[PDB]
Amino acid sequence: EVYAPGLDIESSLKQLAERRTDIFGVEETAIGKKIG
Amino acid sequence: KPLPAPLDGQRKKRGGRRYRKMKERLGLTEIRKQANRMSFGEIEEDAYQE
Amino acid sequence: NVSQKRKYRQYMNRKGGFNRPL
Amino acid sequence: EDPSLLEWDADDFRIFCGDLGNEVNDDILARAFSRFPSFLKAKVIRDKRTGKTKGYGFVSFKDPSDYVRAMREMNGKYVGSRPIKLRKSMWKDRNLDVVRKKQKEK
Amino acid sequence: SYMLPHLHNGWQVDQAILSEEDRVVVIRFGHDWDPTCMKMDEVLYSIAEKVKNFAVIYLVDITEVPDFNKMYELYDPCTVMFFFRNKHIMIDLGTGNNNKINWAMEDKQEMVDIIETVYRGARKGRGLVVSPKDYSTKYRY
RNA sequence: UUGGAAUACAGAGAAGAUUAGCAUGGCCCCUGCGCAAGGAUGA
RNA sequence: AAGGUAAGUAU
RNA sequence: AGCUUUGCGCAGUGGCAGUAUCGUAGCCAAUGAGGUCUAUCCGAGGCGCGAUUUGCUAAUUGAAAACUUCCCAAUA
Description:
This is part of a larger assembly, with chains A, B, C, D and E.
Chain A: H1 6-19
Chain B: H1 17-25, H2 29-33
Chain E: E1 6-7, H1 10-18, E2 24-30, H2 35-50, E3 55-57, E4 59-61, E5 80-84, E6 87-88, E7 90-92, H3 108-124, E8 128-130
Parallel strand pairs in E: 1-4, 2-3, 2-4, 7-8
Antiparallel strand pairs in E: 2-5, 5-6
Helix pairs in contact in E: 2-3
Chain D binds three RNA strands through helix 1, strand 2 and strand 3.
């Protein structure tokens, strides 16, 4: 299929959550904050 | 349902009578009768007759 | 009334000279 | 005026390849295009001095079934840059031209 | 939700673009966490199903692959480079930089028309091609 | 018929186009070929 | 400031 | 032995061949397809999907519409 497998989707979502801390992580530090 | 790939148009290899029959059945014969030419001079209709 | 043939210069695809021949 | 073409006349199923890049067309390209096991022909018209091909080549095969298969197998897909076009070779020899001229009366 | 394939390594994107045949490789540079880039990724996902036959979309992260940031001057969000047929195409749409679309398309149909025009131009062999819709103005009024 | 001459190249489509006719195929009437087969007549 | 790089072809 | 009924394939003519038609590796099937006329009922597939062979040759546009040598000084 065109879309990536489930593992790749999970990794991408985890990376997005780790980077964008506005709606993920313990605290909302910044949009591009490495650590929330 | 992915859209078809827009390949470059290929003309008919050999114009056949059956192909001509389809051209006779479907085509722009009636549209060609109606001339879209417009005179350089002004027409009798108004500016926005439409 | 007579009129001879008219010649022309082959500037395109001519590697003989940079300037057009005369 | 083409003695080599007479030697190439052994294979009847001859196809005309067109839209060839000057550097794109090569013997390796013909070999990659030689899908059918029958012997191919990589001859393409080219300049006498510089060797710049005009974009027209002829591929001869002894199998008309392979001819028909390759007619739609390699239409529009080619390894190099310039996409390939395939046409039924309308090539004629001088004898055929004389015969046609004689028969043109009716 | 950004489920399109993404280049984990920079060299992987290079060989992925190199491994193309009769298809257009839309490499969308940027970051998924950006909001405008998120909108662009959503638009690309919407397009992907309809034009997967010849248009392949393959995202990449600037932080993950910074070696290509200086290659094509990747210093804006939402950048898109139609690297097709191993040749960076010249897509002109009434903008100063006619080789980079660095903002999310307002409508999906416009992007589909753009990508099919790019495919036609690439197949024709020309390295440049124009857009039916000029983007010098945003039609704000 | 000798001998050689043979940044640059080319440039908005040339990665050879556009339009059109006849036959065949397919379809189907009639007829023919190949052919299954019953029915009755006549010497 | 700009919204005004034709592409192609081997050197 | 002649003749006749009928169908397939082939041969010939004619005819239609974008409300014209097949393809289907899908799907309901003579064990009964599918009906709104007839529901102790009609009896054929229903309705999706995939679309409308090959060969001859002309003509047009364009500078060039692609079939395997130019030119130069004088001459044989």
